[PDB]
Design a protein around this ligand. Structure first.
Ligand SMILES: C[C@@H](O)[C@@H](C(=O)O)[C@@H]1NC(C(=O)O)=C(S[C@@H]2CN[C@H](C(=O)N(C)C)C2)[C@@H]1C
Length: 264
């Protein structure tokens, strides 16, 4: 309503851009929504769903996760801190997935996209779990352009949350794969100033961040496990009108706090 939305509008007025938020209490079904069906660039946040798509494919292809990917130096793209170190040996699909999630490794992401049939393959996986909003159209690094009006490489806060719920808490992944995905998100160290900063320290959190680097466009989605309560799933996405507008981790954390504090 208006008292739900009012603190969000104030926050994005001070931020100088747009904030999109969706949070779901998986026990009661209560939600908090703000610009939740608007499109925002995914940036690197797609890499979480990328790892989930790989895990799901391993349910149909036994031993996919252990497949060695031996790549050449030209497979490397900027911001590939893990894959650059294994150029002389190669990495398995599961090792690449861990790097894509926890270090946002770009070469790892592109290698896994290639295994799935390109960006179209990741989009097809998201369609397979009932996500009709998600679209990945381009590769790293071009998908980070975040140009105003462009629907390529975007989703909505609601669809991100709904798909994250299906993959981490629903039946989309088998228990071993589900455990693996949750562990990668929980061990992610790139989001300490985003959704995690809004959550009490004793509550476990798994997240995946995105930071396009332009147009104040950055994001985070997370599963939150309140002690002995039903988990929460939420997504916080930002963008801004000017190419050199700075993203704000504080704004993401503040919006996350508002959403978590508003759940019935
Ligand atoms: C490739 C970039 O656009 C970005 C993305 O894919 O969204 C990369 N992914 C992220 C992200 O935010 O998920 C990062 S690293 C992140 C920001 N810097 C943190 C860090 O490790 N530092 C050393 C500051 C973690 C990179 C900027």
């Amino acid at each position: 309503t208006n008292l739900v939305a009012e603190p969000f509008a104030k926050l994005e007025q001070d931020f100088g851009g747009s904030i999109g938020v969706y949070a779901m209490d998986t026990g009661s079904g209560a939600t908090v929504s703000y610009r939740a069906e608007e499109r925002f660039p995914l940036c690197g946040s797609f890499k979480g769903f990328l790892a989930a798509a790989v895990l799901a494919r391993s349910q149909q292809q036994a031993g996919l996760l252990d497949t060695p990917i031996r790549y050449g130096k030209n497979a490397l793209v900027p911001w590939s801190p893990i894959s650059e170190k294994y150029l002389t040996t190669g990495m398995t699909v599961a090792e690449l997935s861990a790097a894509a999630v926890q270090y946002s490794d770009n070469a790892a992401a592109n290698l896994l996209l290639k295994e799935l049939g390109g960006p179209a393959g990741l989009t097809a996986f998201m369609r397979s779990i009932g996500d009709t909003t998600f679209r990945l159209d381009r590769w790293e690094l071009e998908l980070n352009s975040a140009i105003p009006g462009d629907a390529r490489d975007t989703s909505s806060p609601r669809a991100v949350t709904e798909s994250l719920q299906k993959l981490t808490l629903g039946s989309a992944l088998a228990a071993p794969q589900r455990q693996q995905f949750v562990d990668w998100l929980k061990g992610n160290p790139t989001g300490n100033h985003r959704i995690r900063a809004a959550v009490p320290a004793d509550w476990a959190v798994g997240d995946k961040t995105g930071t396009c680097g332009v147009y104040g466009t950055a994001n985070d989605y997370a599963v939150v496990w309140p002690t002995g309560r039903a988990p929460i799933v939420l997504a916080v996405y930002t963008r801004a009108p000017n190419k050199d507008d700075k993203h704000s981790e504080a704004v993401i954390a503040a919006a996350a706090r508002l959403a978590l504090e508003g759940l019935g």
